[PDB]
Amino acid sequence: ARTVVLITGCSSGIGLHLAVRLASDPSQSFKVYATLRDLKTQGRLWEAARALACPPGSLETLQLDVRDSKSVAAARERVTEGRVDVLVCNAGLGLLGPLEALGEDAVASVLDVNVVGTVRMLQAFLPDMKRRGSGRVLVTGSVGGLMGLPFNDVYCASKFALEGLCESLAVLLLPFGVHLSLIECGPVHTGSPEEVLDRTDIHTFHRFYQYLAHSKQVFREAAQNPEEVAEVFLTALRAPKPTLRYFTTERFLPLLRMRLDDPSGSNYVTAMHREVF
Amino acid sequence: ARTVVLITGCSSGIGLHLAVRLASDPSQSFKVYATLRDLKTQGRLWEAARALACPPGSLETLQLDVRDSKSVAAARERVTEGRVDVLVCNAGLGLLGPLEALGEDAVASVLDVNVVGTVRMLQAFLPDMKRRGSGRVLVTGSVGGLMGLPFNDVYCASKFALEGLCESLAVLLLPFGVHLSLIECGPVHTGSPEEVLDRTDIHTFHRFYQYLAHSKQVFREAAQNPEEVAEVFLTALRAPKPTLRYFTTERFLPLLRMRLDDPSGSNYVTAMHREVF
Ligand SMILES: C[C@]12CCC(=O)C[C@@H]1CC[C@@H]1[C@@H]2CC[C@]2(C)[C@@H](O)CC[C@@H]12
Ligand SMILES: C[C@]12CCC(=O)C[C@@H]1CC[C@@H]1[C@@H]2CC[C@]2(C)[C@@H](O)CC[C@@H]12
């Protein structure tokens, strides 16, 4: 009857706002499983759910740790309807800093949550979709998945990885009737200094500050409401033939095109260096 | 005096051929540390070294496991010259199959060797390069880093990740005088069926066969000599101002451009589906 949606990473941000947008939809078309790594963070989702007056039974929370394939399987068994019509792979971690200041565990964690975590969800959920010959997968992407950003080396690695993962899968899934799309987000309004200085050189440290200053100004001028981003997920959801990629904004497309039409990377690296520094 | 080169993944392929090309250079400009995960595989490198008559002391082998930051640090201490002029990040794993048939450990291993392994090398070696204000980093890339290939979902994820990692770093390293370049390789002439069938559906299994058939024909028609690929690394090495990206072939550039100029991904996914299936 209803469209069953399971969303990862609902404790804040896009995931939180998408979950309550869908559950509160005036048409009541959606049953939403909002999943979270730590149940102690669920308060914010329930406060938003109340604000939007989600009908009882339109929204349920599950604990799901995308690092643990047992946790993934336990949450899938909790989908009482026995299918997922829309899977939204949104859990993700950022990681910001000079590459040599990043702990090895932090690097592996970002990769595990952002890439392997999405692999675990797709392994768990794609089979029943392929069998039914139907289902929609939406994956939260980033501008940092489409072009490299300084001091985001590992975050960008992880978001570029989701691009390759999803594009590869889409080439195969086409004749199966299962549609996968990336939702490419720019900024969204959702170590300490001594720590970082201890792990890098003064010149890199200064470039980091410059990057942070520029980033803050891009964010204050350009950040989108998660309400507006969530509606782009909805657009993808309802598209009779969805495309592989949706963009939540036109903002970064000129930078992207400059990347796109000089494959040597020389124009992009130059332009981004000037843009930031 | 000599240009000190440390290359990862020298047991076969590009890494093996690049190592002996450099060590055997008639000019004797290069001292090469060819590194390998398992020393039992070093025979092939030494057979090639003899064939090309590398002078004694032009080539040394080190054991290096890019999964282990202690192994990385132990090999760096073995660079008797106390600097690395050229770091070649080439170790890599493939992974081929229906996504749901891939073991979780195999997925994590590919990511660890191909992405985190390269992060470990850059963390270990970039600091002294930035300090000197000089050094060249060359990273073995792939066509699968630039466009998604069906049944290579995790391999492509890993090779897309190297793109984001390197591009992000290049934006920063520009004013430091340290130059990083990807060398984008097409095919290079360097589970059992019951296993895979047990882990997927018959229809995906059949698409896998089709992909393998097409792949084999692309390889037989298009595979390059690693001798020819190694010379593209040399070109990058010697370029007074290197670009971010070198391509070893023009072959896949029409497919890439079609990807590049439809950001929605719709033309690429369609064209690649038709190309393979
Ligand atoms: C990381 C930031 C800033 C913080 C964030 O939420 C993600 C966002 C993605 C767009 C980036 C931006 C930093 C400034 C950049 C790099 C602009 O120059 C162009 C794209 C911007
Ligand atoms: C994985 C393969 C085949 C095996 C290999 O060594 C890597 C190589 C990269 C180019 C791929 C190719 C498979 C066939 C493809 C997908 C062609 O259609 C275009 C690019 C090709």
Coordinates of C-alpha atoms and ligand atoms in Angstrom, one line a residue:
Chain A
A1 CA 0.0 0.0 0.0
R2 CA 2.5 2.6 1.2
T3 CA 5.9 3.2 -0.3
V4 CA 8.4 1.7 2.2
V5 CA 11.5 4.0 2.7
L6 CA 14.6 3.1 4.7
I7 CA 17.1 5.9 5.2
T8 CA 20.6 5.7 6.9
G9 CA 22.2 8.5 8.9
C10 CA 19.0 10.2 10.3
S11 CA 20.4 11.7 13.5
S12 CA 20.9 15.1 11.7
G13 CA 21.1 16.9 8.5
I14 CA 19.7 15.7 5.2
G15 CA 18.8 12.3 6.6
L16 CA 16.7 13.8 9.5
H17 CA 14.9 16.3 7.3
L18 CA 14.2 13.8 4.5
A19 CA 12.8 11.3 7.0
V20 CA 10.2 13.7 8.4
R21 CA 9.4 15.2 5.0
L22 CA 8.4 11.8 3.7
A23 CA 6.6 10.7 6.9
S24 CA 4.7 13.9 7.1
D25 CA 3.7 14.0 3.4
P26 CA 0.0 15.2 3.3
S27 CA -0.7 12.2 1.0
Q28 CA 0.5 9.6 3.6
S29 CA 2.1 7.6 0.7
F30 CA 5.3 6.8 2.7
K31 CA 6.2 4.5 5.6
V32 CA 9.7 5.6 6.8
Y33 CA 12.4 3.6 8.7
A34 CA 14.8 6.3 9.9
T35 CA 17.9 4.6 11.0
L36 CA 20.7 5.9 13.3
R37 CA 24.0 4.6 14.6
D38 CA 23.4 5.6 18.3
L39 CA 19.8 5.7 19.6
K40 CA 20.8 8.5 22.0
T41 CA 20.7 10.8 19.0
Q42 CA 17.1 10.1 18.1
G43 CA 15.6 13.1 20.1
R44 CA 16.2 15.6 17.3
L45 CA 14.4 13.4 14.8
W46 CA 11.4 13.0 17.1
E47 CA 11.3 16.8 17.8
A48 CA 11.2 17.4 14.0
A49 CA 8.6 14.7 13.6
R50 CA 6.3 16.4 16.1
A51 CA 6.8 19.8 14.5
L52 CA 5.7 18.4 11.2
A53 CA 3.0 16.3 12.8
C54 CA 4.0 13.0 11.3
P55 CA 1.0 10.6 11.8
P56 CA 1.6 7.8 14.3
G57 CA 3.1 4.8 12.5
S58 CA 4.4 6.9 9.6
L59 CA 7.9 7.0 11.1
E60 CA 9.9 4.4 13.1
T61 CA 13.5 4.5 14.2
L62 CA 15.9 1.5 14.0
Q63 CA 19.5 1.3 15.2
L64 CA 21.8 0.6 12.3
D65 CA 25.6 0.7 12.3
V66 CA 26.7 0.6 8.7
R67 CA 30.2 -0.6 9.8
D68 CA 28.6 -3.9 10.9
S69 CA 27.0 -6.2 8.4
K70 CA 25.1 -7.9 11.3
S71 CA 23.5 -4.6 12.3
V72 CA 22.5 -4.1 8.6
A73 CA 20.9 -7.6 8.5
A74 CA 19.1 -7.0 11.9
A75 CA 17.6 -3.7 10.7
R76 CA 16.5 -5.4 7.3
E77 CA 14.7 -8.1 9.3
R78 CA 12.9 -5.3 11.2
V79 CA 11.2 -4.1 8.0
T80 CA 7.9 -5.7 8.9
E81 CA 6.5 -5.1 5.4
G82 CA 9.1 -7.5 3.9
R83 CA 10.2 -5.1 1.2
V84 CA 12.0 -1.8 0.8
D85 CA 10.7 0.3 -2.1
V86 CA 13.2 3.2 -1.6
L87 CA 16.6 2.8 0.0
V88 CA 18.4 6.0 0.8
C89 CA 22.1 5.6 1.5
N90 CA 22.9 8.8 3.3
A91 CA 25.1 8.0 6.4
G92 CA 28.5 9.7 6.0
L93 CA 31.4 11.2 7.8
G94 CA 33.5 14.2 7.0
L95 CA 37.2 14.5 7.6
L96 CA 39.1 17.7 7.4
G97 CA 42.8 18.5 7.7
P98 CA 46.3 18.2 6.4
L99 CA 46.7 14.7 5.1
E100 CA 49.7 13.9 7.3
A101 CA 47.8 15.0 10.4
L102 CA 45.0 12.5 9.9
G103 CA 45.0 9.4 12.1
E104 CA 45.1 6.2 10.2
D105 CA 42.0 5.0 12.1
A106 CA 40.1 8.1 11.2
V107 CA 41.1 7.5 7.5
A108 CA 39.9 3.9 7.6
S109 CA 36.7 4.9 9.5
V110 CA 35.6 7.5 6.9
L111 CA 36.2 4.9 4.1
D112 CA 34.4 2.2 6.1
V113 CA 31.3 4.3 6.8
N114 CA 31.1 6.2 3.6
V115 CA 32.1 3.5 1.0
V116 CA 32.0 0.0 2.6
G117 CA 28.9 1.0 4.6
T118 CA 27.1 1.8 1.3
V119 CA 28.4 -1.5 -0.2
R120 CA 26.9 -3.3 2.9
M121 CA 23.5 -1.7 2.4
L122 CA 23.5 -2.4 -1.4
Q123 CA 24.6 -6.1 -0.8
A124 CA 21.8 -6.5 1.8
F125 CA 19.0 -4.7 -0.2
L126 CA 19.7 -5.0 -3.9
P127 CA 19.0 -8.7 -4.3
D128 CA 15.2 -8.5 -3.3
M129 CA 14.9 -5.4 -5.6
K130 CA 16.4 -7.2 -8.6
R131 CA 14.1 -10.2 -7.9
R132 CA 11.0 -8.0 -7.8
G133 CA 12.2 -6.1 -10.8
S134 CA 11.6 -2.8 -8.9
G135 CA 13.1 -0.4 -6.3
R136 CA 14.8 3.0 -6.1
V137 CA 18.1 3.6 -4.5
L138 CA 19.1 7.2 -3.7
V139 CA 22.7 7.9 -2.5
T140 CA 23.7 11.2 -0.9
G141 CA 26.6 12.6 -2.9
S142 CA 28.7 15.8 -2.6
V143 CA 30.3 18.4 -4.8
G144 CA 33.5 16.9 -3.2
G145 CA 32.7 13.7 -5.0
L146 CA 32.9 15.5 -8.3
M147 CA 36.0 17.6 -7.8
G148 CA 38.9 17.5 -5.4
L149 CA 39.0 20.0 -2.4
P150 CA 42.2 20.8 -0.6
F151 CA 42.3 19.5 3.0
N152 CA 39.4 17.2 2.2
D153 CA 41.7 14.6 0.5
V154 CA 40.2 11.5 2.3
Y155 CA 36.6 12.9 2.4
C156 CA 36.8 13.5 -1.4
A157 CA 38.4 10.1 -1.9
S158 CA 35.3 8.6 -0.2
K159 CA 32.8 10.7 -2.2
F160 CA 34.6 10.0 -5.5
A161 CA 34.4 6.3 -4.5
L162 CA 30.6 6.5 -4.2
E163 CA 30.5 8.0 -7.7
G164 CA 32.5 5.1 -9.2
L165 CA 30.5 2.5 -7.1
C166 CA 27.1 3.9 -8.2
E167 CA 28.0 4.5 -11.8
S168 CA 29.3 1.0 -12.2
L169 CA 26.2 -0.5 -10.6
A170 CA 23.8 1.7 -12.7
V171 CA 25.3 0.3 -16.0
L172 CA 24.2 -3.2 -14.8
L173 CA 20.9 -2.4 -13.0
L174 CA 19.3 -0.7 -16.0
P175 CA 17.6 -3.8 -17.5
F176 CA 16.6 -5.0 -14.0
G177 CA 14.2 -2.1 -13.4
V178 CA 16.0 -1.0 -10.3
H179 CA 17.0 2.7 -10.5
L180 CA 19.9 4.2 -8.6
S181 CA 20.6 8.0 -8.4
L182 CA 23.2 10.2 -6.7
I183 CA 21.9 13.4 -5.2
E184 CA 24.8 15.9 -5.5
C185 CA 24.7 18.3 -2.6
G186 CA 26.7 21.5 -2.2
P187 CA 27.0 23.0 1.4
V188 CA 23.9 22.4 3.5
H189 CA 22.7 24.4 6.7
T190 CA 22.1 21.3 8.8
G191 CA 41.7 18.2 15.8
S192 CA 42.0 21.5 17.7
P193 CA 44.6 24.0 16.3
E194 CA 47.4 22.8 18.6
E195 CA 46.6 19.2 17.6
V196 CA 46.9 20.0 13.9
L197 CA 50.0 22.3 14.2
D198 CA 51.7 19.4 16.1
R199 CA 51.2 17.2 13.1
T200 CA 52.1 19.4 10.2
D201 CA 54.4 22.2 9.1
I202 CA 53.7 25.9 9.7
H203 CA 53.2 26.6 6.0
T204 CA 50.6 23.9 5.5
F205 CA 49.0 25.0 8.8
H206 CA 48.7 28.5 7.3
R207 CA 47.2 27.2 4.1
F208 CA 44.7 25.2 6.2
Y209 CA 43.6 28.4 7.8
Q210 CA 43.2 30.1 4.5
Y211 CA 41.1 27.1 3.3
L212 CA 38.9 27.3 6.4
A213 CA 38.4 31.1 5.9
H214 CA 37.3 30.6 2.3
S215 CA 35.1 27.6 3.2
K216 CA 33.3 29.6 5.9
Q217 CA 32.5 32.3 3.3
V218 CA 31.3 29.8 0.7
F219 CA 29.1 28.3 3.4
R220 CA 27.6 31.6 4.6
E221 CA 26.9 32.8 1.0
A222 CA 25.8 29.4 -0.5
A223 CA 24.5 26.9 2.1
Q224 CA 21.1 25.5 1.2
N225 CA 18.2 24.6 3.6
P226 CA 18.0 20.9 4.2
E227 CA 14.3 21.4 3.4
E228 CA 15.3 22.4 -0.1
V229 CA 17.8 19.5 -0.5
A230 CA 15.2 17.0 0.8
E231 CA 12.8 18.0 -2.0
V232 CA 15.5 17.1 -4.7
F233 CA 15.5 13.6 -3.2
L234 CA 11.7 13.7 -3.6
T235 CA 12.0 14.8 -7.2
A236 CA 14.4 11.8 -7.9
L237 CA 12.0 9.5 -6.1
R238 CA 9.0 10.4 -8.2
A239 CA 10.8 10.6 -11.6
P240 CA 9.3 8.0 -13.9
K241 CA 12.8 7.4 -15.4
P242 CA 15.4 8.8 -13.1
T243 CA 18.8 9.8 -14.2
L244 CA 22.0 8.7 -12.5
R245 CA 22.7 12.2 -11.1
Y246 CA 20.6 15.1 -9.6
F247 CA 22.2 18.4 -8.6
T248 CA 20.7 20.3 -5.7
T249 CA 22.3 23.5 -7.0
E250 CA 23.7 25.2 -10.2
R251 CA 26.4 26.9 -8.0
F252 CA 29.4 24.7 -8.6
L253 CA 28.6 23.6 -12.2
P254 CA 30.8 26.2 -13.8
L255 CA 33.8 24.9 -11.8
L256 CA 32.7 21.4 -12.6
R257 CA 32.5 22.1 -16.3
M258 CA 36.0 23.6 -16.3
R259 CA 37.1 20.3 -14.7
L260 CA 35.1 18.3 -17.1
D261 CA 36.6 19.8 -20.3
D262 CA 40.3 19.7 -19.5
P263 CA 41.0 16.0 -18.8
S264 CA 44.7 16.8 -17.9
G265 CA 43.4 18.5 -14.7
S266 CA 45.6 21.5 -15.3
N267 CA 42.8 24.1 -15.6
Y268 CA 40.9 22.7 -12.6
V269 CA 43.9 22.6 -10.3
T270 CA 44.9 26.1 -11.2
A271 CA 41.3 27.6 -10.9
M272 CA 40.6 25.8 -7.6
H273 CA 44.0 26.9 -6.2
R274 CA 43.2 30.6 -7.1
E275 CA 39.6 30.2 -5.8
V276 CA 40.8 29.0 -2.4
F277 CA 44.1 30.7 -1.9
Chain B
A1 CA 73.8 12.5 -7.5
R2 CA 71.2 9.9 -8.8
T3 CA 67.5 10.4 -8.8
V4 CA 66.2 8.2 -6.0
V5 CA 62.9 6.3 -7.0
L6 CA 60.8 4.1 -4.7
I7 CA 58.1 2.1 -6.5
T8 CA 55.3 0.0 -4.8
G9 CA 53.9 -3.2 -6.2
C10 CA 56.9 -4.4 -8.2
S11 CA 56.1 -8.2 -8.3
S12 CA 54.5 -7.9 -11.7
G13 CA 53.0 -5.6 -14.3
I14 CA 53.6 -1.9 -14.6
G15 CA 55.6 -1.8 -11.4
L16 CA 58.0 -4.5 -12.4
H17 CA 58.6 -3.1 -15.9
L18 CA 59.0 0.5 -14.6
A19 CA 61.5 -0.5 -12.0
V20 CA 63.8 -2.2 -14.6
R21 CA 63.3 0.5 -17.2
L22 CA 64.6 3.1 -14.7
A23 CA 67.4 1.0 -13.2
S24 CA 68.6 -0.1 -16.7
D25 CA 68.5 3.5 -18.2
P26 CA 71.6 4.0 -20.3
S27 CA 72.3 7.3 -18.5
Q28 CA 72.4 5.6 -15.0
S29 CA 70.4 8.6 -13.7
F30 CA 68.2 6.5 -11.3
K31 CA 68.6 4.5 -8.1
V32 CA 65.5 2.3 -7.8
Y33 CA 64.0 0.8 -4.6
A34 CA 61.5 -1.8 -6.0
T35 CA 59.2 -2.8 -3.2
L36 CA 57.0 -5.9 -3.0
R37 CA 54.5 -7.3 -0.4
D38 CA 56.0 -10.9 -0.5
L39 CA 59.7 -11.4 -1.2
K40 CA 58.9 -14.8 -2.7
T41 CA 57.6 -12.9 -5.7
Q42 CA 60.9 -11.1 -6.4
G43 CA 62.3 -13.7 -8.9
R44 CA 60.4 -12.2 -11.8
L45 CA 61.8 -8.7 -11.1
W46 CA 65.4 -10.1 -11.0
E47 CA 64.9 -12.1 -14.2
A48 CA 63.8 -8.9 -16.0
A49 CA 66.7 -7.0 -14.3
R50 CA 69.2 -9.4 -15.8
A51 CA 67.5 -9.3 -19.2
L52 CA 68.0 -5.6 -19.3
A53 CA 71.4 -5.8 -17.6
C54 CA 70.7 -3.4 -14.8
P55 CA 74.1 -2.4 -13.4
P56 CA 74.8 -3.7 -9.9
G57 CA 73.5 -1.2 -7.3
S58 CA 71.0 0.4 -9.6
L59 CA 68.1 -1.8 -8.2
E60 CA 67.3 -3.0 -4.7
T61 CA 64.3 -4.8 -3.5
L62 CA 62.5 -4.0 -0.1
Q63 CA 59.6 -5.8 1.5
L64 CA 56.7 -3.3 1.9
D65 CA 53.2 -4.1 2.9
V66 CA 51.1 -1.0 2.2
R67 CA 48.4 -2.3 4.6
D68 CA 50.8 -1.8 7.5
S69 CA 52.2 1.7 8.4
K70 CA 55.1 0.0 10.3
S71 CA 56.1 -1.7 7.1
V72 CA 55.9 1.6 5.3
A73 CA 58.1 3.3 7.9
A74 CA 60.7 0.4 7.9
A75 CA 61.1 0.6 4.1
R76 CA 61.5 4.5 4.3
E77 CA 64.3 4.0 6.9
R78 CA 66.0 1.6 4.4
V79 CA 66.4 4.4 1.8
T80 CA 70.1 4.9 2.5
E81 CA 70.3 8.1 0.6
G82 CA 67.9 9.8 3.1
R83 CA 65.5 11.2 0.4
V84 CA 63.1 10.0 -2.3
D85 CA 63.1 12.1 -5.4
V86 CA 60.3 10.2 -7.1
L87 CA 57.6 8.1 -5.3
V88 CA 55.6 5.8 -7.5
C89 CA 52.4 4.6 -5.9
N90 CA 51.5 1.6 -8.0
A91 CA 50.5 -1.3 -5.7
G92 CA 46.9 -2.3 -6.4
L93 CA 44.3 -5.0 -6.3
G94 CA 41.5 -5.8 -8.7
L95 CA 38.2 -7.2 -7.7
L96 CA 35.7 -8.6 -10.2
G97 CA 32.2 -9.9 -9.7
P98 CA 28.5 -9.2 -8.9
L99 CA 28.5 -6.8 -5.9
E100 CA 26.5 -9.2 -3.7
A101 CA 29.0 -12.1 -4.4
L102 CA 31.9 -10.1 -3.0
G103 CA 33.1 -11.0 0.5
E104 CA 33.2 -8.1 2.9
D105 CA 36.8 -8.7 3.6
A106 CA 37.7 -8.7 -0.1
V107 CA 35.9 -5.3 -0.4
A108 CA 37.8 -3.9 2.6
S109 CA 41.1 -5.3 1.4
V110 CA 40.8 -3.6 -2.1
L111 CA 40.0 -0.3 -0.3
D112 CA 42.8 -0.7 2.2
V113 CA 45.5 -1.6 -0.4
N114 CA 44.4 0.7 -3.2
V115 CA 43.3 3.8 -1.2
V116 CA 44.5 3.7 2.4
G117 CA 47.8 2.1 1.2
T118 CA 48.4 5.2 -1.0
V119 CA 47.4 7.5 1.9
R120 CA 50.0 5.7 4.1
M121 CA 52.7 6.2 1.5
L122 CA 51.8 9.9 1.0
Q123 CA 51.7 10.5 4.8
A124 CA 55.1 8.8 5.1
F125 CA 56.8 10.5 2.2
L126 CA 55.2 13.9 1.4
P127 CA 56.5 15.7 4.6
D128 CA 60.2 15.6 3.6
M129 CA 59.3 16.5 0.0
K130 CA 57.4 19.6 1.2
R131 CA 60.3 20.5 3.4
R132 CA 62.8 20.3 0.5
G133 CA 60.4 22.1 -1.8
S134 CA 60.9 19.3 -4.3
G135 CA 59.8 15.8 -5.3
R136 CA 57.6 14.0 -7.8
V137 CA 54.8 11.6 -7.0
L138 CA 53.4 9.3 -9.7
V139 CA 50.2 7.3 -9.0
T140 CA 49.0 4.4 -11.2
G141 CA 45.5 5.2 -12.3
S142 CA 43.0 3.4 -14.4
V143 CA 40.3 4.0 -17.0
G144 CA 38.0 2.4 -14.2
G145 CA 39.0 5.5 -12.1
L146 CA 37.5 7.8 -14.7
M147 CA 34.3 5.9 -15.6
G148 CA 32.3 3.2 -13.9
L149 CA 32.5 -0.4 -15.3
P150 CA 29.9 -3.1 -14.5
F151 CA 31.1 -5.9 -12.2
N152 CA 34.0 -3.7 -11.2
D153 CA 31.9 -1.7 -8.7
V154 CA 34.5 -1.9 -5.8
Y155 CA 37.6 -1.7 -8.1
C156 CA 36.1 1.4 -9.7
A157 CA 35.2 2.8 -6.3
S158 CA 38.9 2.4 -5.3
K159 CA 40.3 4.0 -8.5
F160 CA 37.8 6.9 -8.4
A161 CA 39.0 7.4 -4.8
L162 CA 42.6 7.8 -6.0
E163 CA 41.4 10.4 -8.4
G164 CA 39.7 12.5 -5.6
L165 CA 42.6 11.9 -3.2
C166 CA 45.2 13.1 -5.8
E167 CA 43.2 16.0 -7.2
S168 CA 42.6 17.3 -3.7
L169 CA 46.3 17.1 -2.8
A170 CA 47.4 18.7 -6.1
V171 CA 45.4 21.8 -5.4
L172 CA 47.4 22.2 -2.2
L173 CA 50.9 21.0 -3.3
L174 CA 51.2 23.4 -6.2
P175 CA 53.0 26.2 -4.3
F176 CA 55.2 23.7 -2.5
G177 CA 57.0 22.6 -5.6
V178 CA 56.0 18.9 -5.2
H179 CA 54.3 17.6 -8.3
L180 CA 51.8 14.8 -8.3
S181 CA 50.4 13.1 -11.4
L182 CA 48.1 10.2 -12.2
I183 CA 49.1 7.9 -15.0
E184 CA 45.8 6.7 -16.5
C185 CA 46.2 3.2 -17.9
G186 CA 43.8 1.2 -20.1
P187 CA 44.3 -2.6 -20.3
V188 CA 47.9 -3.7 -20.0
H189 CA 49.5 -7.0 -21.2
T190 CA 51.3 -7.7 -17.9
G191 CA 35.6 -16.9 -7.3
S192 CA 35.2 -19.9 -9.7
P193 CA 31.8 -20.0 -11.7
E194 CA 30.1 -22.3 -9.1
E195 CA 31.3 -19.9 -6.4
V196 CA 29.8 -16.8 -8.1
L197 CA 26.6 -18.6 -9.1
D198 CA 26.0 -19.7 -5.5
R199 CA 26.1 -16.0 -4.5
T200 CA 24.0 -14.4 -7.2
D201 CA 20.9 -14.8 -9.4
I202 CA 21.0 -16.5 -12.8
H203 CA 20.3 -13.3 -14.7
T204 CA 23.1 -11.4 -13.0
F205 CA 25.3 -14.5 -13.6
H206 CA 24.6 -14.3 -17.3
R207 CA 25.3 -10.6 -17.5
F208 CA 28.6 -11.3 -15.8
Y209 CA 29.5 -13.8 -18.5
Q210 CA 28.6 -11.2 -21.1
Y211 CA 30.8 -8.6 -19.4
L212 CA 33.7 -11.1 -19.3
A213 CA 33.3 -11.9 -23.0
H214 CA 33.4 -8.2 -23.9
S215 CA 36.3 -7.5 -21.6
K216 CA 38.3 -10.3 -23.1
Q217 CA 37.8 -8.9 -26.6
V218 CA 38.7 -5.3 -25.5
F219 CA 41.8 -6.8 -23.9
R220 CA 42.8 -8.8 -27.0
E221 CA 42.2 -5.8 -29.3
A222 CA 43.5 -3.0 -27.0
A223 CA 46.0 -4.2 -24.3
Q224 CA 49.2 -2.2 -24.3
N225 CA 52.8 -3.5 -23.6
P226 CA 53.9 -2.5 -20.1
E227 CA 57.0 -1.3 -21.8
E228 CA 54.9 1.3 -23.6
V229 CA 53.0 2.2 -20.3
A230 CA 56.3 2.5 -18.4
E231 CA 57.5 5.1 -20.9
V232 CA 54.5 7.3 -20.1
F233 CA 55.6 7.3 -16.4
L234 CA 59.0 8.4 -17.7
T235 CA 57.5 11.3 -19.7
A236 CA 55.6 12.5 -16.6
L237 CA 58.9 12.2 -14.6
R238 CA 60.9 14.4 -16.9
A239 CA 58.2 17.0 -17.6
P240 CA 59.5 20.4 -16.3
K241 CA 55.9 21.3 -15.2
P242 CA 53.9 18.1 -15.0
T243 CA 50.1 18.0 -15.4
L244 CA 47.8 16.3 -12.9
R245 CA 46.8 13.6 -15.4
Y246 CA 48.6 11.6 -18.2
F247 CA 46.8 9.1 -20.5
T248 CA 48.6 6.1 -21.8
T249 CA 46.2 5.8 -24.7
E250 CA 43.6 7.8 -26.7
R251 CA 41.3 4.7 -26.9
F252 CA 38.8 5.4 -24.1
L253 CA 38.8 9.2 -24.5
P254 CA 35.6 9.3 -26.7
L255 CA 33.7 7.3 -24.0
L256 CA 35.2 9.6 -21.4
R257 CA 34.2 12.8 -23.2
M258 CA 30.6 11.5 -23.6
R259 CA 30.7 10.9 -19.8
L260 CA 32.3 14.3 -19.3
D261 CA 29.7 16.4 -21.2
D262 CA 26.5 14.9 -19.8
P263 CA 26.8 15.5 -16.0
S264 CA 23.3 13.7 -15.4
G265 CA 25.2 10.4 -16.3
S266 CA 22.4 9.4 -18.6
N267 CA 24.4 9.3 -21.9
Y268 CA 27.3 7.5 -20.3
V269 CA 25.2 4.8 -18.6
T270 CA 23.3 4.1 -21.8
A271 CA 26.4 4.0 -24.0
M272 CA 28.4 1.8 -21.7
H273 CA 25.4 -0.5 -21.3
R274 CA 25.1 -0.9 -25.1
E275 CA 29.0 -1.2 -25.4
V276 CA 29.1 -4.1 -22.9
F277 CA 25.7 -5.8 -23.4
Ligands
LIG1 C1 33.6 22.0 1.7 C2 32.5 23.0 1.4 C3 32.3 23.8 2.7 C4 31.5 23.0 3.8 C5 30.5 22.1 3.3 O1 29.4 21.9 3.9 C6 30.8 21.3 2.0 C7 31.2 22.3 1.0 C8 31.1 21.8 -0.4 C9 31.4 22.9 -1.3 C10 32.8 23.5 -1.1 C11 33.0 24.0 0.3 C12 34.3 24.7 0.5 C13 34.6 25.8 -0.5 C14 34.5 25.3 -2.0 C15 35.8 24.5 -2.2 C16 34.3 26.3 -3.2 O2 35.5 26.9 -3.6 C17 33.7 25.5 -4.3 C18 33.1 24.2 -3.7 C19 33.2 24.6 -2.2
LIG2 C1 38.4 -3.8 -17.4 C2 39.1 -3.7 -18.7 C3 39.6 -5.2 -19.1 C4 40.7 -5.7 -18.3 C5 41.7 -4.7 -17.9 O1 42.9 -4.9 -17.8 C6 41.3 -3.3 -17.4 C7 40.4 -2.9 -18.6 C8 40.1 -1.4 -18.5 C9 39.3 -1.0 -19.8 C10 38.0 -1.7 -19.8 C11 38.2 -3.2 -19.8 C12 36.8 -3.9 -20.0 C13 36.1 -3.4 -21.3 C14 35.8 -1.9 -21.2 C15 34.7 -1.6 -20.2 C16 35.4 -1.1 -22.5 O2 34.0 -1.2 -22.9 C17 35.8 0.3 -22.3 C18 36.8 0.3 -21.2 C19 37.1 -1.2 -21.0

